[PDB]
């Protein structure tokens, strides 16, 4: 799960970036190419 | 699950970006190509 | 599930982008190509 | 573009799966959330 | 582009899986959240 | 681009898996969250 | 119950305030949110 | 119960304040959020 | 209960304040958040 | 301002109390008995 | 301001109390009995 | 300001109390009985 929050007060600027990310180009907890005999 | 929130106060700027993301190009918890004999 | 919220106060700007996303190009919790003998 | 082909000769089996896929949960070459001032 | 091909000769087996995939949970060459002032 | 090929001769087996994949959970050549002032 | 009384004799002044109050923003002897099983 | 009384004799002044108060922002003898099983 | 009384004789002054108060921001003898099993 | 929320899942009980309150017997931000000469 | 939240999962009990409160018998930020000569 | 949160998982009990409070019988940031000559 993800809980993202951003709260702004008094801000003066030319440029501002806020970047919040969890899974970007990811295979978390994945099973890929499994073989079981029985 | 995802809970995203953004609250603005007093903001003065030329440019501002807020980017919130969870699963971008992802296969979280996926099973791909599994083989079971019995 | 997703719960997205954005609240604006006092904002003055040339450009502003708010981008909220959960599953973009994703196969979360998917089963693809599974084979079971019995 | 896709050019998928499968030819079977002499095959004997309990189970056989052939899985050919392209762009499964994808946004290839897509523009999402773009802003140009002029 | 994809050019997928499979040819079977003399094959005998309990289970056989052939899995050919391209761009599974992908955003290849995508533009997401871009801002240009002019 | 992908050029995937598999040719079977004389094969006898309990289980056989052939897994060919490209760009699985990937953002190759993608632009995410870019800002240019002018 | 309230018994408020003010008697003026010989008084000379720019400003005079007499403030008599009882139960201002009060919940005296109140039952709020009570639960009895039997 | 309140018994408030003020008697003025010979008084000369720029400013005079008499402030008599009882139970200002109070919950005297109140039951809030009580639970009894039986 | 309150019994507040003020009597003025011969008084001459720039400023005079008489402040009589009882239970200002108080929860005297209150029950808050009580639980009994039986 | 007040933002109150309660969400129930799987609940089994003899008795349950949820009590949410902000201003109970309160004079928040109040002016009482002010005197200004000019 | 107040932001109160309660979320229930799997709960089994004889008795449960949740009590959330901010200003109970309070005079926060109040001016009471002020005198200014000019 | 106050931000109160309670999240329940797997709970089994005879009795449970959660009590969250900020200002109970309080005069935070209050001015009471001030006198200024000018």
State the CATH number of the domain containing residue H19: 4.10.230.10
In a 13 Å sphere around the CA of J34, the CA atoms on its Cβ side amount to 9
First to last CA, chain I: 35
Phi, psi of H23 (to 5 degrees): 65, 65
Residues 6+ apart with CB under 8 A from C1: B1, B2
Output the six-digit token pair for A29: 């907890």
Resolution for this model in angstroms, one decimal place? 2.4
Output the six-digit token pair for E37: 């002032």
CB atoms within 10 A of CB B24: 26
Grouping H, G, I as helix, E, B as strand and the rest as coil, residue H16 is strand
Put simply, the answer to whether H35 touches K15 (Cβ < 8 Å) is yes
Count structural domains, chain I.
Answer: 1
Put simply, the answer to whether K38 touches J37 (Cβ < 8 Å) is yes
| Cβ density class D1-38: b for 16+ within 10 Å, e for less | eeeeeeeeeeeeeebbebebbbbbbbbbeeeebeeeee
- Residue K4 vs residues C6, E4, L3: alpha-carbon distances, Å: 18, 57, 6
Grouping H, G, I as helix, E, B as strand and the rest as coil, residue D28 is coil
The Cα angle at residue C17 between residues C15 and C18, in degrees rounded to 5 = 150
Residue L2 forms contact with I (CB below 8 Å): no
Identify whether the C-beta of residue E23 lies closer than 8 Å to the C-beta of residue F27.
no
Considering only the beta carbons, identify the residue of C10, C16, C20 that sits closest to B16.
C16
| Experimental technique used to determine this entry | cryo-EM
Q: Which of H17, H19, H22 to mutate to test the interface with G (most CBs of G within 10 A)?
A: H22
Q: How far apart are CA A20 and CA E27, in angstroms?
A: 18
Considering only the beta carbons, identify the residue of J15, J19, J35 that sits closest to G15.
J35
Place of tokens 């896709």: D2
| Structural domain range at position J15 | 1-38
What are the chain C neighbours of B5 within 8 Å (beta carbons)? 4-6
Considering only the beta carbons, identify the residue of H9, H17, H29 that sits closest to I10.
H9
Chain J, nearest residue to K20 by Cα: J20
Q: How far apart are CA D12 and CA B36, in angstroms?
A: 18
Q: How far apart are CA F16 and CA F12, in angstroms?
A: 9
CB atoms within 10 A of CB K12: 13
* CA-based nearest residue to C16, from A17, L33, L22, E28: A17
Residues 6+ apart with CB under 8 A from J34: K31, K34
Chain H, nearest residue to G12 by Cα: H12
What are the chain J neighbours of H19 within 8 Å (beta carbons)? 33
Identify whether the C-beta of residue L32 lies closer than 8 Å to the C-beta of residue I25.
no
Phi, psi of C9 (to 5 degrees): -95, -110
Which subunits count as partners of chain D given 3+ CB pairs below 8 Å? C, E
DSSP tag of L37: -
Residue C38 forms contact with E (CB below 8 Å): no
């Amino acid at each position: 799960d993800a809980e993202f929050r951003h709260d702004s007060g008094y801000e003066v600027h030319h440029q501002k970036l806020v970047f919040f990310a969890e899974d970007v180009g990811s295979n978390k907890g994945a099973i890929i190419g499994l073989m079981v005999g029985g």
